[PDB]
Design a binder for this molecule. Structure first.
Ligand code: HEM
Length: 199
């Protein structure tokens, strides 16, 4: 684990895969209702990181970071299907500091691998202009855009104890994503995909 980015990854791949499994478990693209529940979920998570993509300091460290946010697009997708911007019951996490850097990674990385999701959403007749705006690949190409993003993440070079809090934040970002998922899909507390399942 050299770079800060490859360390965030190393430490969170496990929980990442459990999310991958949990998302696939609830059949997101099986029907329309389900894809709508999938959007509500994406909506809550992205709402929860919107203040972080828009944070003034981080926007100084990462040029145009604020224009990378995808909550805006998710609200547009919900509209697409005659839906009001979903509203979460409780009050959303509003993280800051080192931990917030972990949420950002979690969020920006999901745009990287969103390829798989985008591919299955298009079957359901959804894409960049209708229903799947937030899953569409970045105009500069997922890989390029992500490598560019990783550059600035690594450039932050915070104290090793800071990078630590960020990894702790990325882990909590993932856990939270699952809490939201469980509630949106009517799953019990701590519900996880069938054990042993692999992507
Ligand atoms: C069924 C849904 C999902 C699938 C199939 C999936 C798949 C993938 C794949 C295959 C990659 C590797 C991309 C590459 O290196 O080219 C990736 C990266 C990533 N995904 Fe997911 N993912 C899913 C959901 C999520 C969600 C909902 C989050 C966030 C809450 C998430 C966060 C990330 C992050 C942070 C990365 C970057 C990993 C890195 O450091 O390279 N993923 N995903």
């Amino acid at each position: 684990a050299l770079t800060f980015a490859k360390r965030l990854k190393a430490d969170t791949t496990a929980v990442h895969d459990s999310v991958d499994n949990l998302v696939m478990s609830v059949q997101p693209f099986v029907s329309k209702e389900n894809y709508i529940k999938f959007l509500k979920l994406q909506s809550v998570f992205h709402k929860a990181v919107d203040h972080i993509y828009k944070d003034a300091e981080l926007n100084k460290a990462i040029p145009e970071l604020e224009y990378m946010a995808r909550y805006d697009a998710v609200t547009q997708d919900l509209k697409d299907l005659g839906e009001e911007p979903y509203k979460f019951d409780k009050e959303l996490p509003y993280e800051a500091g080192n931990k917030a850097i972990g949420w950002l990674y979690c969020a920006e990385g999901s745009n990287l691998g969103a390829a798989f999701l985008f591919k299955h959403a298009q079957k359901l007749d959804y894409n960049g202009e209708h229903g799947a705006r937030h899953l569409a690949p970045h105009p500069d190409g997922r890989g390029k855009h992500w490598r560019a993003f990783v550059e600035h993440l690594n450039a932050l070079n915070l104290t090793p104890e800071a990078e630590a809090e960020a990894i702790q934040g990325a882990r909590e970002a993932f856990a939270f994503y699952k809490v939201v998922l469980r509630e949106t899909f009517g799953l019990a507390a701590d519900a996880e995909a069938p054990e042993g399942m692999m992507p």
